[PDB]
Write an enzyme that holds these catalytic residues in place. Structure first.
Site, PDB file in Angstrom:
ATOM      1  N   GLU A  75      41.762 -22.201 120.878  1.00 50.91           N
ATOM      2  CA  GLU A  75      42.027 -23.520 120.330  1.00 50.91           C
ATOM      3  C   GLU A  75      43.414 -23.644 119.710  1.00 50.91           C
ATOM      4  O   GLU A  75      43.914 -22.703 119.123  1.00 50.91           O
ATOM      5  CB  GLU A  75      40.964 -23.868 119.277  1.00 50.91           C
ATOM      6  CG  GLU A  75      40.817 -22.848 118.203  1.00 50.91           C
ATOM      7  CD  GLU A  75      39.922 -23.292 117.080  1.00 50.91           C
ATOM      8  OE1 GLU A  75      38.717 -23.250 117.301  1.00 50.91           O
ATOM      9  OE2 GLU A  75      40.449 -23.718 116.059  1.00 50.91           O
ATOM     10  N   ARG A 123      45.112 -30.687 108.953  1.00 49.48           N
ATOM     11  CA  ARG A 123      45.216 -30.421 110.384  1.00 49.48           C
ATOM     12  C   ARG A 123      44.621 -31.528 111.193  1.00 49.48           C
ATOM     13  O   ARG A 123      44.812 -31.567 112.430  1.00 49.48           O
ATOM     14  CB  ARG A 123      44.430 -29.195 110.781  1.00 49.48           C
ATOM     15  CG  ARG A 123      45.255 -28.040 110.870  1.00 49.48           C
ATOM     16  CD  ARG A 123      44.497 -26.836 110.861  1.00 49.48           C
ATOM     17  NE  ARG A 123      44.115 -26.486 112.205  1.00 49.48           N
ATOM     18  CZ  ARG A 123      42.926 -26.055 112.526  1.00 49.48           C
ATOM     19  NH1 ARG A 123      41.957 -25.977 111.601  1.00 49.48           N
ATOM     20  NH2 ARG A 123      42.690 -25.719 113.768  1.00 49.48           N
ATOM     21  N   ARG A 128      42.705 -31.504 118.993  1.00 49.24           N
ATOM     22  CA  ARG A 128      42.886 -30.126 119.426  1.00 49.24           C
ATOM     23  C   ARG A 128      43.030 -30.061 120.944  1.00 49.24           C
ATOM     24  O   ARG A 128      42.538 -30.943 121.667  1.00 49.24           O
ATOM     25  CB  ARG A 128      41.640 -29.274 119.105  1.00 49.24           C
ATOM     26  CG  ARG A 128      41.129 -29.281 117.651  1.00 49.24           C
ATOM     27  CD  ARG A 128      42.019 -28.465 116.751  1.00 49.24           C
ATOM     28  NE  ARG A 128      41.446 -28.451 115.376  1.00 49.24           N
ATOM     29  CZ  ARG A 128      41.756 -29.282 114.404  1.00 49.24           C
ATOM     30  NH1 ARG A 128      42.697 -30.179 114.569  1.00 49.24           N
ATOM     31  NH2 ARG A 128      41.167 -29.151 113.207  1.00 49.24           N
ATOM     32  N   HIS A 140      37.371 -33.436 116.650  1.00 49.00           N
ATOM     33  CA  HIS A 140      36.948 -32.116 116.235  1.00 49.00           C
ATOM     34  C   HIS A 140      35.742 -31.587 117.013  1.00 49.00           C
ATOM     35  O   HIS A 140      34.785 -31.104 116.482  1.00 49.00           O
ATOM     36  CB  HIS A 140      36.664 -32.079 114.691  1.00 49.00           C
ATOM     37  CG  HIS A 140      36.424 -30.698 114.175  1.00 49.00           C
ATOM     38  ND1 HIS A 140      35.229 -30.314 113.588  1.00 49.00           N
ATOM     39  CD2 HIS A 140      37.244 -29.615 114.098  1.00 49.00           C
ATOM     40  CE1 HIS A 140      35.312 -29.040 113.232  1.00 49.00           C
ATOM     41  NE2 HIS A 140      36.526 -28.594 113.511  1.00 49.00           N
TER      42      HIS A 140
END
Length: 97
Positions: free
Chosen positions: A55, A66, A70, A86
């Site tokens: 990831e 953050r 991703r 997420h």
């Protein structure tokens, strides 16, 4: 028990382009978790042995954490998945569009 859609490279946010470039280069990455193994515990991506998936953070402009965006990479060349929530949903990145 959820399929994986497709998203065109051209349709990803510019920060995701940055992430993909960084993965190609091997760094530098902004967060300590960038490059760690993604365990795929919920089974949303195809089942592989542990270590198949890693990831990386996609920076969210204006976020002080953050955030939730991703890139997950698989072991095969150009096998990349994007999530903006997420890991609740994924789409396979399509480099041909």
């Amino acid at each position: 028990v959820k399929a994986v859609g497709r998203v065109c490279y051209s349709a990803l946010p510019s920060q995701a382009h940055d992430t993909l470039d960084l993965i190609d280069e091997g760094g530098p990455f902004p967060y300590s978790q960038d490059g760690v193994v993604f365990q795929n515990r919920e089974g949303l991506l195809p089942a592989h042995s542990t270590g198949y998936y890693h990831e990386y953070t996609v920076i969210t402009p204006g976020s002080p954490t953050r955030g939730a965006r991703r890139i997950i990479t698989g072991q095969q060349w150009q096998e990349d998945y994007y999530t903006a929530d997420h890991y609740a949903s994924f789409r396979r990145v399509d480099f041909a569009c």
